[PDB]
Amino acid sequence: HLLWDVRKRSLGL
Amino acid sequence: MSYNYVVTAQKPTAVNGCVTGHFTSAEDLNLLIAKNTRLEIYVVTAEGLRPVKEVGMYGKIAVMELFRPKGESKDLLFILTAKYNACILEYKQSGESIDIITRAHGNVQDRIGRPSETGIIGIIDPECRMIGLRLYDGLFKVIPLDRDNKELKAFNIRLEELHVIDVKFLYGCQAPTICFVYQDPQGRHVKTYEVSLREKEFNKGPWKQENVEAEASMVIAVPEPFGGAIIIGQESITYHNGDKYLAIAPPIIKQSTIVCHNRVDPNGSRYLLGDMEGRLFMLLLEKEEQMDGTVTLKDLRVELLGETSIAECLTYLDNGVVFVGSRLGDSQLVKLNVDSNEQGSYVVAMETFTNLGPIVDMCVVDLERQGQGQLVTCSGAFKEGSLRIIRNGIGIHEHASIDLPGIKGLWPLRSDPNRETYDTLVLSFVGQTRVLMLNGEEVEETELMGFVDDQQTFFCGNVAHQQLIQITSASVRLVSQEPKALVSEWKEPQAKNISVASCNSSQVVVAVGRALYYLQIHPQELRQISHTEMEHEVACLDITPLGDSNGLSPLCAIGLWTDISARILKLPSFELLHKEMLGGEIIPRSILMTTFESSHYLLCALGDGALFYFGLNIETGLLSDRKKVTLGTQPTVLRTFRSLSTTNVFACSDRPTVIYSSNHKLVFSNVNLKEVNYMCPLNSDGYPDSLALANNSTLTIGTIDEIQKLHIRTVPLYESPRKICYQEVSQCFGVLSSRIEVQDTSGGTTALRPSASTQALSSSVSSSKLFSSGEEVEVHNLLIIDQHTFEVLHAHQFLQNEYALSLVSCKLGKDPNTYFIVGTAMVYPEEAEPKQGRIVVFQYSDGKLQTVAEKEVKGAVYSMVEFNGKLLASINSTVRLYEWTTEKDVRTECNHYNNIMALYLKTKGDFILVGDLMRSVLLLAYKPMEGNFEEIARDFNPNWMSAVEILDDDNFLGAENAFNLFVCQKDSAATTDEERQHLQEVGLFHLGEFVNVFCHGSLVMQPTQGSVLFGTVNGMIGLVTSLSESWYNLLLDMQNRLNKVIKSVGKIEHSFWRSFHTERKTEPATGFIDGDLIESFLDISRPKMQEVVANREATADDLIKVVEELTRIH
Structure with missing residues (x-):
């Protein structure tokens, strides 16, 4: 989900 | 006509790559550490690292390898940038002067081609005949290495395998040969090709395509004495050569994905492996032989050596020492010992190098009530998680x-x-x-x-x-x-x-x-x-x-x-x-x-x-x-x-x-x-x-x-912080945080290592009953952190599967009390767009946390700024505005729905707001009319935003995802219901970094206008200021003068580098200056400097003063 996918991004690869 | 200045306040600290060899001299061990746009050069000594050179490049280093062809005194360095700038570098010293030289360069992007899954991968054959690259799906790019080819010109070869995972040039190969794990529908497969430039095709490799595991993902090519490929899966690892197949499934690796390897011994008897976890393995190739005849491989095993910071990069140096390249947390130097002391960890840390980590959110301070700002940042992730107070x-x-x-x-x-x-x-x-x-x-x-x-x-x-x-x-x-x-x-x-x-x-x-x-x-x-x-x-x-x-x-x-x-x-x-x-x-x-x-x-x-x-x-x-x-x-x-x-x-x-x-x-x-x-x-x-x-x-x-x-204080959290607020009246910070925990023998969750949320002085869990309908889970908390002591005063644990995602600290309505409000989201792996979550209003009393109020919501509360005595809050696609009853409750007034996914909002005092996820930035007012929202203007570009700030009543900064900044403003235009409704990107710029957070603040004080700080995934802190048209021009011009004059490391056009660029558009930068460039000035010899002036007036060193005056904004 975006949530996870928004985290993973704020924290790079 | 937007005019801005951007400068580094702190360079990136995350370590993106690193490499070892002899680049300084034939007889001298260098470690090269790539940050983002920084190459760091060290000599390894008995003590550890002797710094030798810290050059920048006009690019995100994507590939960094040392190599040495025939008739070569010392290792050349190959660099591929992310904008596809390739170059070859040579370490040169004029006795006392050190210069890194460009022996070749060329841009290798192809107008054709989609950039593959798993990113760029460049590689280099043992004999150094060439450089093999994989940038695009279907294509493999070959660059012969010859005294000539100074322009690194390269042909492509077609590659049936559209979805490659990793590739290495095999050792001991008559022909240049590659080995690669690719993924089709069937599974994942290892395959080989000899490579001939003679006729720009592949041929077949020395061995039948085999199979490899579903999560297989690293190829390692083992040096001359052994040959073949080590291929590393999840829960498993294997070896391949002609007919040889060796395999191992130690459960000890099952729990986390291996993530980097590095060879210890040239023969490759030994290898180091790192983990999503920080665990450091040692991968041994059990010796073996048969008289006159090269060494075979009887076996291989894993020895958990211990734990490091989470490793991007790993590099054995001299004796038992290993540099741990970290991006999620602090990098470190680390001794390996034959004997495992207490706890049983052969890995003892020697040095620890600060990484401002990925900076996930941050805020000014606001500590010793002085007049300077300390910057306080949520950093790292998982066990590297931390706060970092930064004081200039x-x-x-x-x-x-x-x-x-x-x-x-x-x-x-x-x-x-x-x-x-x-x-x-x-x-x-x-x-x-x-x-x-x-x-x-x-x-x-x-x-x-x-x-x-x-x-x-x-x-x-x-x-x-x-x-x-x-x-x-x-x-x-x-x-x-x-x-x-x-x-x-x-x-x-x-x-x-x-x-x-x-x-x-x-x-x-x-x-x-x-x-x-x-x-x-x-x-x-x-x-x-x-x-x-x-x-x-x-x-x-x-x-x-x-x-x-x-x-x-x-x-x-x-x-x-x-x-x-x-x-x-x-x-x-x-x-x-x-x-x-x-x-x-x-x-x-x-x-x-x-x-x-x-x-x-x-x-x-x-x-x-x-x-x-x-x-x-x-x-x-x-x-x-x-x-x-x-x-x-x-x-x-x-x-x-x-x-x-x-x-x-x-x-x-x-x-x-x-x-x-x-x-x-x-x-x-x-x-x-x-x-x-x-x-x-x-x-x-x-x-x-x-x-x-x-x-x-x-x-x-x-x-x-x-x-x-700059000084940096560090509160280690052991878990991963997410957002953070200062509540001065109560002299503490709230910090949203998350740890991870396993399903138990039936479902429950334990707690591997203690973190800030479990070691807390006091604590809480949500009581609230608002709902009712191996395995890793996240547990999320609000944390009360003493500003003086940085002790976890209190921890509030949130519901099972509830995510705190937004955090404010404000007074609401007439109510003279100050709350920690927290927007949340009930998150299950089934869907992917939360339909429930909450807003909770906390108060922190004498030593106490009072759940003052809650509010169910029908989506994820993504962000929420405090508006105007009211509480503005984005609730998944729909931004709403909640009021605070006298009778102490959050109740609605208005909402706006024109939002694909409102991730970010910000508020210029006035009834003005701004944001979005994949369709970059709307502007909105609030109307003391029907107490409503009027959408004043959006921006009709397809920007996947990451951060968003208001600089002034007209100027709107956004960061997005290609690492580009852009400014928007309202169009002063006739026909004022169209050109009006559309705001124009009037400043573009490629930053080179992923911006998580903007905030108004400054690190300094007790020319420029405003001061917005930013924290990046890399630990870079930038700063963005606004400009008079005249300083702009002074500086814009100066930017051009400066670039004819500076030798850009790998001969990269600066202007090409700073060019707003997505994989679908490339424009030159407008309305932006890197003070980083500007500041390049001062590190310049007076001759090169005088040149910069050929022509209110134009001096010679009146500017040497102008540039100084700026260095002082951070």
Whole structure:
């Protein structure tokens, strides 16, 4: 989900 | 017409790649650490890292390999950038000057081609015939290596395998051969091809395509003695050569994905493996053989070695030492030992290198209620998680404080021969001298035989052979330890006044004008030696027995009065050597000679405030490096203080500065004081190592922090922080955080290691019942952090599967109370767009956390700023505005729905808001009309946003995802219901970084307009300011001039680099300047600098001042 996918991004690869 | 300036405040600290070999010399071990746009060059020593070079590039380094073809003295470096700039680099030194050279370059992007899953991968064949790249799906790019090919020109070859995972050039291969794990529908497969340039095709590799596991993902090619490929899956690892297949499924790897390998032993008997976890494995190739015939491979196994920071990069160095390249947390140096001490960890940490981590959110401070901002950042992730307080400058801690509007100098006296402590302070005064016999920590002013009290003392050293000294206007007196009276007392043969002092503890030099003398405190009396006049009046004199001298002192250095000059001389002779004829009508108010790590230095402060630094030679004594630097508008006094070993120089001015010792260089960091006039070391039995400081009126004494321009304090969290708020009234920070935990023997979750949320002083869990319907889960908390102590005062645990995602601290409505509100989201792996979540209103009482109010919501509360006594909050696609009843509850007024996914909002005081996820940034007002939302304007570009800030009523900054910044503003346009409804991207720029957070704040103070800070995934902190059109132009032009002149490392066009660029559009930057470029100026030789001006006016070094004035915004 975006949530996870928004985290993973704020924290790079 | 948007105009902005961007500068680094802190370079990226995350380590993106790293590599080892001999790039400096054939016989010297270098580690090269790639940050983002920074290459760091080290020699590995017995101690560890000797820094050698820190170059930047105009690009995100994507590939970094060392290599060496035939007829090559030392390893060349290959670099591929992310914008597809390839280059080949060579380390070159001109004895004392170090230069990295570009042997070749070319851009290798193809207009064709989609960039593959798993990113760029470049590689290099063992024999160095070539460089193989994989940038695009379907294509493999080949770059022959030949004396020529300076342009790195390259053909592609077609590749049936559309979805490759990893590739390596196999060792011991008659033909250039590659080995690669690719993924089709069937699974994942290893495959090979010999590679021929002879006819630009592949051929087949030496072995049948085999199979490999579903999560297979690293290829390793094992060196000449063994050959073949090690392929690393999840829960498994395997080997491949022609017919050979070896495999292992240690459960010990199951729990986390391996993530980096690195070879330890050239033969490849040994390899290091890192993990999403931080666990460090050792992958051994069990030896074996069969007489005359190369070594086979009987077996291979994993040995958990221990734990490191989470590793992007791993690199065995010398003996048992390994550098751990980290991006999620602090990087480190780390010793491996044959023996595993306590806990059983063969891995002991040696050094720890600070990574500001991915900075996930941050905020200003706001601590010692001073006037500067400390920046407080949520950093790292998982166990690296942390806060990091960042304070600009070097602070000092004040103990006593005697208000004295005179102090004109001060000197460090012990009254007891034995003790290393000094119980007296003699200080120059308004044509006087006051003495201060301290009763330990107590102040008391009395006499002291032979130390004139009605005379402006000009010195007061600690002269050996049991004596005290007091150079006054008049006579250079002398006083005993045994007798303690008037042992001697000099006096110029003519009744003439001393103008300029000098001394150490054995040597004495005075001056009277142009005149020079020289005395000696030989047991119990002052005996003279020389006398020599000078061109002009002596401004200042330095002498300290430097290296090979114990009390008695070698050469000499002087600043004079009419010709404004500073000049190298000797001793009993007084013979003029080399000299500098510094410009200006203002006199050098202070000259200093010193020593540091292993070097001698000559420093000269003038009275204009500016300075000149030069290197002295204890033996030879001549020029060095011409370059003045402004500081204290008021003459700078230089002294030298007690710290540690590298003991340094203090600059006293309106702008007090320390001068450190960088990479055998010298730091120039601000000191956090109001002003300093004079300053000296200390050690009283009641004021240990302290430097007393004196300004307009006040004595002061305290310790000194580290050095490095900026200081960083670190609260280790062990879990991963997400958002963070300061609530001043309650003197604490709230921090949203998350840890991870496993499903239990039935479902429950434990807690591997303790984190901030479980070690909390007190604690809570959500009671709220609002709902009702191996395995890793996240557990999320609000944390109360004491601002003073950075203790976890309290932890609130949220519901099972609830995500705190937004955090405010505000007063709401008429209610004179201040809350920690937290937007949340009920998150299950089934869907992917939360349909429920909550807003919770907390209060933190005496020591207490009161759940004041909750509110169910029908989506994920993504962000929520406090609006206007109300609470504005984005709830998944729909932004709403909640009001606070008198009766203490969050209830709706209005919403707006024109939002694909509102991730970010910000509020310019006025009823104005802004944001979005994949369709970059709307602007909205709130209407004290039908208390409603009117959508004033959006931006019709397809920007996947990451951060968003309001700079002013018209200017809207956004960061997005290609690492690009852009500014938007409202279109002043006729036909005002269309051109109006559309705001224009009027500033573009490729930053090179992923911006998580903007905030108004600054690191500095007690030209530019506004100051927005930013924190990046890489730990870069930038800063963005706004500009007058004229500074813009000055600077815009200067940007162009500067680029014809600077040798951009791998010959990369700067303008190409800064070009707003997505994988679907490329425009040049507008409305932006890198101060980083601008600042490039100062590191420039005057010739290259003069060139920069060929043409209100246009000067030559009026700019040298303009550029300085900017360096001071951070």
